[PDB]
Amino acid sequence: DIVMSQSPSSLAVSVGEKVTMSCKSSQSLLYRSNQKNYLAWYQQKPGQSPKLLIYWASTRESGVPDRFTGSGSGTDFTLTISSVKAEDLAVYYCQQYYNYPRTFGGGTKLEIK
Amino acid sequence: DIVMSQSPSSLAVSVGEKVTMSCKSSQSLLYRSNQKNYLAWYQQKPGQSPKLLIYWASTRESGVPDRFTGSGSGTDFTLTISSVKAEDLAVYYCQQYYNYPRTFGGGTKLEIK
Amino acid sequence: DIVMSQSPSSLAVSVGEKVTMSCKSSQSLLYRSNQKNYLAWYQQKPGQSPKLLIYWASTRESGVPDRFTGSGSGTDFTLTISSVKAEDLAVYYCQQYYNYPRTFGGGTKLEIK
Amino acid sequence: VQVQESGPGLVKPSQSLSLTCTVTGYSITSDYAWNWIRQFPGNKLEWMGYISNSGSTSYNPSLKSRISITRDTSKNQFFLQLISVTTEDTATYYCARERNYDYDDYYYAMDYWGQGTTLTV
Amino acid sequence: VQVQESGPGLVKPSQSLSLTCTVTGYSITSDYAWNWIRQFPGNKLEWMGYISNSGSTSYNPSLKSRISITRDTSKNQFFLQLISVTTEDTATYYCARERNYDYDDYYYAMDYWGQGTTLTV
Amino acid sequence: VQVQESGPGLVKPSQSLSLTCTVTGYSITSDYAWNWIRQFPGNKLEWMGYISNSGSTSYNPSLKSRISITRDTSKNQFFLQLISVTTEDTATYYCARERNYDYDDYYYAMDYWGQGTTLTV
Amino acid sequence: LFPQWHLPIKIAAIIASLTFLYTLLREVIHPLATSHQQYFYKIPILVINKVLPMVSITLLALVYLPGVIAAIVQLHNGTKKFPHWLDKWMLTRKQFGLLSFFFAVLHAIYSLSYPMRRSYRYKLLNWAYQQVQQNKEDAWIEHDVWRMEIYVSLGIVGLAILALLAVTSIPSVSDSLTWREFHYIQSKLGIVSLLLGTIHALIFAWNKWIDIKQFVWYTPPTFMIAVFLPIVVLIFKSILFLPC
Amino acid sequence: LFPQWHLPIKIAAIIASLTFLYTLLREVIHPLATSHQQYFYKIPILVINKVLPMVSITLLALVYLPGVIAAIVQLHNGTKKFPHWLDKWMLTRKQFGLLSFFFAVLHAIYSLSYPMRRSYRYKLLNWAYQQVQQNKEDAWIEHDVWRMEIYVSLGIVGLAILALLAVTSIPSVSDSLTWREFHYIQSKLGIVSLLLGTIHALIFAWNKWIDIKQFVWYTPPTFMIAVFLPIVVLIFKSILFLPC
Amino acid sequence: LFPQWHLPIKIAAIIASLTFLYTLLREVIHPLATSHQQYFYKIPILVINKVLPMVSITLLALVYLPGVIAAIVQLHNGTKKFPHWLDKWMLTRKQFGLLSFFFAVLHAIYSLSYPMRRSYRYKLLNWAYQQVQQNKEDAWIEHDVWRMEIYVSLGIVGLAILALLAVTSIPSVSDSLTWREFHYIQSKLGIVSLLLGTIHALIFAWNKWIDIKQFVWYTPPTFMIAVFLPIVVLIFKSILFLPC
Ligand code: HEM
Ligand code: HEM
Ligand code: HEM
Ligand SMILES: CCCCCCCCCCCCCC(=O)OC[C@H](COP(=O)([O-])O)OC(=O)CCCCCCCCCCCCC
Ligand SMILES: CCCCCCCCCCCCCC(=O)OC[C@H](COP(=O)([O-])O)OC(=O)CCCCCCCCCCCCC
Ligand SMILES: CCCCCCCCCCCCCC(=O)OC[C@H](COP(=O)([O-])O)OC(=O)CCCCCCCCCCCCC
C-alpha cells in the first residue's frame, strides 16, 4: 500500500494570502508510459462529502475556482491556494490512484485566522 | 466469487411431464471472445457421485439421454427435462467455471409424484 | 510454495574424499523458455552469513573453489565436492528462485571425520 | 446524478450489516465504477472496495476477507456486507463513483461522492 | 479411468489430516487437471482447490491459508492437507478430474468424479 | 558494498518492531533488489519479502498480513515492520541483495548477504 | 535532371513538411508546454506514420482532381482548350500516382511494425497487470474489434489496387496494352483505390469525430484534414456520373 | 479488353467465391445456427486470409498441371499434337503464375497484420489474466513453438521464389534472357515454390488431421482441400522424374 | 546460363554459409555443449534473420568498395588502366545491388513476423505473470523504447531507398534516364542507403559493445562482423570527399 503523508497537519492563514500544502508519497506515482502523475486533491467542507478539486496533480476539476493550483511530480506534490477566501476553510486530502488499493492522506485542516 | 442461485429449491412432478430448473447467476458467464457460456449442470443420484449432464450450458455430455436440454445465456440459465422418468429423481446442481474459484448452486431436489 | 527436500540431513566424510548432496524439488524448476534451472546452493560456515556457491544449478559464483560442481535438471539436483578440505565444514542449503515465495531446503550439515 | 446511501444506524458487534447505495438518474452499468469509502471519526479516509460496471470487484487487502460488494442492476443498487463487524467498524460510509478504466489514460478519479451514512456498533 | 479416494474417517479437532486420490488406469500428468470438491451434510458443494498436470495449484480463497494439494507422480496420487481441522470440516470429499486449460475454449468441465470419502471430526 | 543490519534485540510479545538495513558504498535504487531472510534457531531459513529498486514490494504469503518493507532512499536504508510479534518471530534476520529482474535471464540469485541481527521476544 | 519530378516532389515535400510540424505540434509540443510530458519517443514512428498516409492519400486525390476540373470547365465553356496551369497539371498525373504509392507502402510497413516495437510490449505488460489488479476477466470489447478488422482489411485491398497502378507504370508493361485497357486501369480501378483509401481512414475514426479530446487547442485531428480532399473528389466524380 | 486474362480471372473468381462461401459456412454460419454465436468479426480478416492462400496455391498448381498432362498424353499416344482445350490452357500459364503471386502477397500482408489487430490484443490480456488466475508459470509449449517457427519460415522463402517468377515476367526483363535461362527459372525454381508452398501448409496442420473438431458437420477443414491439388501435381512430377 | 550471376551468387552463398555456421555455433551449439540447452527452435527464424541482414549489408558494401579502390589506385599511379580483377568486379556492381535488395526484403519480412510467432506469445504471458508475481507496476523502460523506435524507423527508410535502386535496375526504366540521372540514383542515393543501413545496426547495438556476455567463447557478436565492412567503406568515401 502506497503510504501518503501530508506535511502540515494543520496550518493557519488569514483571508487573502498564499498557502501551500504538501503530500509526500511513498513510491513514485508517475506512470512512465504516459507521463501523468496519478494523484488527486479533495476538499471536505465541515459536514459535507469530499469534493474533487484537482486530478492528475495538475488539472482542475470542472467548476473549481482558479486559485487552486496543484504541482509536483514523482513523490512530492503540492496544492497551492493563491488567495485564501472565507469559504476555503475545509480539510484537504490527497489520494493516489496509481494502483490498488487507493490510499488517502492524513488530511490537512485549514484554519482561517 | 460468482454467486449461483437456483430458483426452485425443491419442486415436485409426475412421471412423463415437462419440468424446468433455473440457475440465476451473479455476473455474466459469457466470454465475449468466444461466445460460450461457461456453466455446467450436474445430477447427483441418491448416494452417488455427481455426474455431468450439460456443459457450456447447451451441449449434452456423451451418454446423456436426449430429454435433457439446457438453454439460456448471460446470467439466466435453465435446465429442461422433456419427459420426467422414474430414474430422473436426483439433485441437480449448476456450477460455473467462468473463473476461479468455481461455485456451485444451492441444488434443486426433484421429487417424483 | 515449492517444497525443497535435501536427501542427506547430515553426512560425515574425511578430508580428501568425494561427497554428494541431493536436493529433491516439488515441481520442476526449469523454465522451458530459456532452459535454465533456477536453483542455488549456499554455504553457511559456523557463525557466519550464508554465501552463494552455485547459481542456476551449474555455474559457480565468482570466487568459489573449483571442487564445487552442481548438476541435475528438473526436480533432482546434486551438489558435488571433489575433494573435501578442512574449511568445507558448513551447512549447505539449496534454494529455488523459480517463483515467489523463495523456499530453502532443510540444510545438509557436513561433518568432517 | 443523485446517489443516496442507506442501511442500519446501530448494529451489535460480531454481526453482519448490509448498506445500500441506490443510484438515481443514471444506470450503474454503463460507464462508471462505484467505490466504497469509509471515514473514521478521526477524519481518516479508507478505501474499502469498488465494483466495476461488469460485476468485477476488488477489495482492500486489509479487510478483503470480511467484505463483499454486490449489486442489483434491476434497480441500480449496491450492497456492502461486513460479515463480522467490530468496534473499529464504526465510521461514515460514502459510495463515490469514478469514470471506469481506459487503456489510454487509466484510473481517472473519484469525482462525485454521496452524502454518506453513519454506522455505529 | 478408475479413481478412488482414501484417508482417515475420524480425526480429532485442531489436527491435520491427509487424503489420497490414487488414480488408476491413467497418468495424472498428461492432459487432465484434478480438483478437490467437498459436500457438506446439507447437500452444499464447495470447490476447495485444483492441481494442474504441471504441479501448479490454486485454492479456494475462503480456505487458502489452511490447505495444501500435493501430488506423487511416481504412483499417480494426490494429497489434500487441512492443517487445522474444525467442526465445519466434516463433509464428503470427492476428487474430480477435468480437461486441462486450452487457449481456444478454456475451462471445459469437471466430467468424471470419484466415489468420495466421508470425513468426520 | 558493505551492508549492516540494526534494530532492537529484545521486544515484548504482541508488539511492533522495526529493523534497519543501512547500505553503505552503493545506491539502493540502481540495479539491485534487497530481500529480507530470517533464520530460526533450528537452522531453518525463511524468505520474508523483498523490495525492488523502484519501491515495489512482495511478501511471503504465510505472513503477508503482518509485515511491511519500506525504504529511505535519502540515506540508503530499509525497514522491516512486524506489526504483531510473537514467540515464533525470534530468529536471525539477514538482508541480502540480488541482481534485479531481467527479461532475458530472470531472478539471478541472492549473492551478497549481511551479517544479520538477532531478534528475541 | 528529372524535369517531370520537380513539381510532384516539391508538392510532396510541402505537404510532408507542413503536416509534420502540424502533427508534431499536436502530439509532442502541446503536451510538453502544458502539463510537461516528454512524449519524445513518438516522433520516429507514431508521428512519421501520420505524415506518410496523409501525403499518400492527398497525392492520390491530386491524380483525379484535374480529371474533375477538366470536365466542369469543358461544360463551363461548352467547348476547345485548357489553361496552361491545368494542362501542365494533367501531365504530372503519372508522377503523382507513383509518389502516392511510394508513400503508401511506407505507411504500410510502418503500420505492420507496430506490434514489433518495445513501446507496444511495455504497454501490454502494464495493461495485463492493471487488469489483474482490478479482477476484470474478459477484457474483450466487441465494437472495438469490429473497427480494427475492417479498416485494416480495407487498407490492404486498397494498397493492392495501387500496386496494379504502379506495375502498369513500367514503360515496358505500359507500352504493351491498348489505350482502352490502360485507361481502364488508371481510371476505373484507380478511383476505387481512392475510395478504399478514404474509407480505410473513416472507419479508423469510428467515433473520434464527436470527441473533443482530439482537438488539442483548436486544430482538428490530423485525419480530418487528410480525408477532406478525397471526399471532395469522390462526390464530384459521383455528381458527374449522374446524367449530365 | 484483356483477352488473355478472361480465363484466369474467371477461374480465380470461381475458386475464390466457392471457397469464401465454404469457409464462411464453417466459421460463421455453423456456430450461428447451432449454439448461437456471433463470430461476425472473423469475416474481414480471418475468413479472407483463408480464401487468399487457397486461391494462391491452387492457381500455382494449375501452372504445372498442364506440364504433367502434356507429358503423359505424349506417352499415351507415343507422338504429334495437343487437343484444343490443352493448348489453350498451356498459353495461360503466364497469367496463372501472376495471379498466384498477386494473391500470395495479399495472403502475406494479411498474415503479417495478425498481431496488429485489436482482437489479438484482447485475447492476450485474457490469456495473461487466466494464467495468473491459475498460478501457471512458464506457459511455454515446446512442440507448438517448433510448428510456428517452421511453417512461417518456409512460407517466406516460398514467397521469395515466387517473386523471382514474377519479376522475370516483365517483358523487358523476360526478353533479356536466353530460353535456357528463362525455362530454368519458370520450371526448376518454379516447382520449388510449389513444394515450399504446400509444406508451408502441411506443417501448419501439425496434428489437425486426426482431430475431429475440424469437421464442422461433415466438411473437411479448408487446408485439406487446398493442399490436395498441389500434392497430386508434385507426386506426378516425381513419378515422371523417375526413368521413363 | 546466367553468366553475370555466377560470381555474385557464389560470394553470396559463401557469406551466407559461413555466417550461418558462425551464428548457429554461438546461439545453438554453444548452449547445447556447455550446460545442455536445446534452443533448437531458434534455427528457423532467429538464426536465419541473423544471416540475411549480414549478407544484405555486406553485399551492399561490395557495391561501393570498388568505387573507392578505383579512386585510390587512380591516384596511386596518377593516371590509365584498371587491373583485370578490378574491372571484372566493377561490372558486377549491378548484380550485387540486386542481391543485397533481395536479402533486405527477406530480412524485412522475417523481422515483421516476430510478434506473429508463438514463441513471442508464450514469452509475453510469462513476463506478464512474472510482473504480477513481483507487484511491479509500470514495466516501462525509457531508454530501451528510445532504441527500438529509432533503429526500426531507420531500417524502413533504409529499405525504401534500396527499392529506388532496385526499380531503376529494370532495363525499360533504366534505359529511360540520362546518365546524369542514373548516376545520381546509383551513387548519391545509393550510398545513403548504406549509411542508413549501418546506423540501423549500430543503434540496434545500443550498449551491447561493452557487454561481455555477447562473446560466447571468444567470437564477437554477429553484428560486429556485419558493420565492419560498411564502416570501412563509409569513412574512405568521406576521406575522398575531402579536398584531394
Ligand atoms: C498495408 C495496408 C495498410 C495498413 C496496414 C494500414 C494501416 C493503418 C493504420 C494502422 C492506421 C492507423 C494509424 C494510427 O494508429 O494512428 C492507418 C491510418 C491511415 N491510413 Fe492506412 N493502412 C494501409 C493502407 C493505406 C492506404 C492504401 C491508404 C490510402 C492511400 C491509407 C491511408 C491511411 C490514412 C489517411 C490514415 C489516417 C492517418 C491519420 O491518422 O491521420 N492507408 N493505416
Ligand atoms: C510471407 C510469407 C507467408 C506467411 C507469413 C504466411 C503465413 C501464413 C499463416 C500464418 C497461415 C496460417 C493462417 C491461419 O492462421 O489460419 C498460412 C496458411 C497458409 N498459407 Fe501461408 N504464408 C506465407 C506464404 C505462403 C505461400 C507462398 C503460400 C503458397 C502459395 C502459402 C499458402 C498457405 C496455405 C495454403 C495456407 C493454409 C490455408 C488454410 O488455412 O486453409 N502461404 N500462411
Ligand atoms: C523493413 C525494414 C527493416 C526492419 C523492420 C529491420 C528490422 C531489424 C531488426 C528487428 C533487427 C534486429 C534483429 C534481432 O532482433 O536480432 C535488425 C537487425 C539488422 N538489420 Fe535490419 N531491418 C530493416 C532493414 C534493414 C536494412 C535496409 C538493412 C541494411 C541492408 C538492415 C541491416 C540489419 C543488420 C546488419 C542488422 C544486424 C544483424 C545482426 O543482429 O547481426 N536492416 N533489423
Ligand atoms: C501488393 C500486390 C503486389 C502484386 C504484384 C504483382 C501484380 C501483377 C498483376 C498483373 C499486372 C499486369 C497486368 C497486365 O495486363 O499485364 C500484362 C502483361 C503481359 O502481357 P502479354 O505479354 O501477355 O501481352 O503483364 C506483364 O508482363 C507484367 C508483369 C509484371 C510483374 C511485376 C512483378 C513485380 C514484383 C516485385 C516484387 C514484389 C515483392 C512483394
Ligand atoms: C519499399 C518502397 C517501394 C516503392 C516502389 C515504387 C517506387 C517508385 C519510385 C519512382 C521510381 C522511378 C523513378 C523515375 O525517374 O522513373 C521515371 C519513369 C518514367 O519516365 P517517363 O516515362 O516519365 O520519362 O518511371 C517509371 O516509369 C517507372 C515506374 C516503376 C514502378 C514500379 C512499381 C513496382 C511495384 C511492385 C510491387 C510492390 C508491392 C509492395
Ligand atoms: C520478396 C522478394 C522481392 C525481391 C525483389 C527483387 C528480386 C530481384 C532478383 C533478380 C531478378 C532478375 C534476375 C535476372 O536474371 O535478371 C537479369 C536482369 C539484368 O540483365 P542484364 O542487363 O545484366 O543482361 O535483371 C534486371 O535488370 C531486372 C531487375 C528487376 C528489379 C525489380 C525490383 C522490383 C522492386 C519492387 C518494390 C519492392 C518493394 C518491397
Side-chain angles (χ1 to χ4, degrees), chain G residues 101 105 109, chain H residues 101 105 156 159-161 163-164 167-168 170 173 176-177 181 185, chain I residues 2 4-5 94-95 98-99 101-103 105-106 109 159 163 165-171:
Chain G
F101 175 74
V105 289
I109 298 179
Chain H
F101 175 74
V105 290
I156 296 180
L159 176 65
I161 299 181
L164 301 187
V167 69
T168 55
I170 302 179
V173 189
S176 175
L177 318 172
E181 293 170 353
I185 292 185
Chain I
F2 295 102
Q4 299 181 2
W5 291 89
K94 179 190 182 63
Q95 285 67 268
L98 289 180
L99 291 188
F101 175 74
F102 174 77
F103 290 112
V105 290
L106 287 187
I109 298 179
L159 176 65
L165 296 181
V167 69
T168 55
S169 300
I170 302 180

Side-chain angles (χ1 to χ4, degrees), chain E residues 2-78:
Chain E
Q2 178 69 19
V3 70
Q4 175 184 0
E5 294 80 4
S6 299
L10 188 272
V11 297
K12 309 303 172 300
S14 68
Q15 207 186 344
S16 303
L17 49 76
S18 180
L19 305 184
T20 319
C21 181
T22 64
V23 176
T24 63
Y26 203 79
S27 63
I28 64 174
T29 63
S30 62
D31 54 334
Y32 282 98
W34 294 81
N35 319 32
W36 278 95
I37 307 98
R38 68 179 183 184
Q39 185 177 14
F40 297 117
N43 294 123
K44 167 189 174 183
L45 290 166
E46 181 187 21
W47 177 84
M48 304 180 64
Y50 98 107
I51 167 174
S52 175
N53 61 334
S54 305
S56 305
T57 67
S58 181
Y59 315 107
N60 194 324
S62 62
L63 60 151
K64 182 184 177 182
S65 58
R66 49 177 190 90
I67 197 183
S68 177
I69 300 180
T70 64
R71 68 175 184 178
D72 185 6
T73 180
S74 301
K75 48 183 56 59
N76 295 20
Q77 296 190 351
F78 305 104

Side-chain angles (χ1 to χ4, degrees), chain I residues 36-223:
Chain I
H36 318 78
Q37 291 167 18
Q38 180 182 4
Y39 284 167
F40 282 148
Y41 72 95
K42 294 185 177 181
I43 299 181
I45 290 185
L46 293 181
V47 170
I48 303 301
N49 197 23
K50 290 188 177 305
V51 177
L52 301 175
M54 179 168 178
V55 171
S56 177
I57 198 178
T58 301
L59 291 180
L60 182 56
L62 298 181
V63 183
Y64 314 97
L65 184 54
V68 174
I69 294 184
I72 65 176
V73 305
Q74 186 181 7
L75 310 181
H76 195 73
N77 299 93
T79 179
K80 181 178 179 300
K81 67 178 184 301
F82 299 94
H84 166 52
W85 59 268
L86 177 59
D87 210 334
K88 163 68 176 182
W89 191 3
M90 289 282 297
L91 298 181
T92 61
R93 292 184 302 174
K94 179 190 182 63
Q95 285 67 268
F96 282 143
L98 289 180
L99 291 188
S100 173
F101 175 74
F102 174 77
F103 290 112
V105 290
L106 287 187
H107 164 54
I109 298 179
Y110 269 96
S111 301
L112 296 181
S113 66
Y114 275 0
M116 185 177 56
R117 308 171 305 160
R118 292 297 183 86
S119 65
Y120 186 79
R121 170 196 302 184
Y122 297 146
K123 287 190 298 182
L124 270 182
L125 302 185
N126 290 7
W127 295 336
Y129 176 85
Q130 294 167 1
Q131 165 165 350
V132 176
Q133 194 73 7
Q134 62 199 188
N135 296 324
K136 184 229 300 181
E137 331 83 354
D138 193 16
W140 186 276
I141 296 181
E142 185 65 25
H143 75 86
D144 190 17
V145 174
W146 261 105
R147 177 188 64 93
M148 191 76 184
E149 305 299 82
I150 292 182
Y151 82 83
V152 167
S153 176
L154 296 179
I156 296 180
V157 300
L159 176 65
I161 299 181
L162 271 184
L164 301 187
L165 296 181
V167 69
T168 55
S169 300
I170 302 180
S172 56
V173 189
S174 179
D175 306 333
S176 175
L177 318 172
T178 177
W179 184 89
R180 184 178 65 260
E181 293 170 353
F182 177 81
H183 174 270
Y184 178 84
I185 292 185
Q186 307 289 151
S187 180
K188 308 301 176 60
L189 287 185
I191 196 62
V192 174
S193 177
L194 179 57
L195 175 61
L196 294 180
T198 176
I199 300 180
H200 161 54
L202 295 183
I203 303 300
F204 163 71
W206 188 279
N207 48 339
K208 299 179 178 58
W209 298 90
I210 58 183
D211 190 3
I212 317 296
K213 185 174 51 57
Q214 302 293 337
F215 305 83
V216 275
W217 280 308
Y218 292 103
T219 71
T222 170
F223 62 83

Side-chain angles (χ1 to χ4, degrees), chain F residues 50 52 56-59 64 101-107, chain I residues 126-127 129-131 133-137 139-141 213:
Chain F
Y50 98 107
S52 175
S56 305
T57 67
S58 181
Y59 315 107
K64 182 184 177 182
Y101 177 90
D102 185 15
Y103 294 88
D104 311 331
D105 40 359
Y106 5 88
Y107 300 150
Chain I
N126 290 7
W127 295 336
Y129 176 85
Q130 294 167 1
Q131 165 165 350
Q133 194 73 7
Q134 62 199 188
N135 296 324
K136 184 229 300 181
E137 331 83 354
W140 186 276
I141 296 181
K213 185 174 51 57

Side-chain angles (χ1 to χ4, degrees), chain B residues 43-51 87-92:
Chain B
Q43 172 190 39
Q44 184 178 16
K45 301 292 183 59
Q48 291 187 8
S49 63
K51 57 179 300 299
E87 58 277 3
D88 299 358
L89 180 139
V91 187
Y92 297 87

Side-chain angles (χ1 to χ4, degrees), chain G residues 130-143:
Chain G
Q130 294 167 1
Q131 165 165 350
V132 176
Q133 194 73 7
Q134 62 199 188
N135 296 324
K136 184 229 300 181
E137 331 83 354
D138 193 16
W140 186 276
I141 296 181
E142 185 65 25
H143 75 86

Side-chain angles (χ1 to χ4, degrees), chain F residues 11 19-20 27 45 50 55 57 62 77 82 84 89 91 93-94 96 101-102 105-106 108 113 116 119 121:
Chain F
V11 297
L19 305 184
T20 319
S27 63
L45 290 166
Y50 98 107
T57 67
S62 62
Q77 296 190 352
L82 295 177
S84 63
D89 294 9
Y93 293 74
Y94 313 94
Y101 177 90
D102 185 15
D105 40 359
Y106 5 88
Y108 290 86
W113 292 56
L119 196 277
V121 297

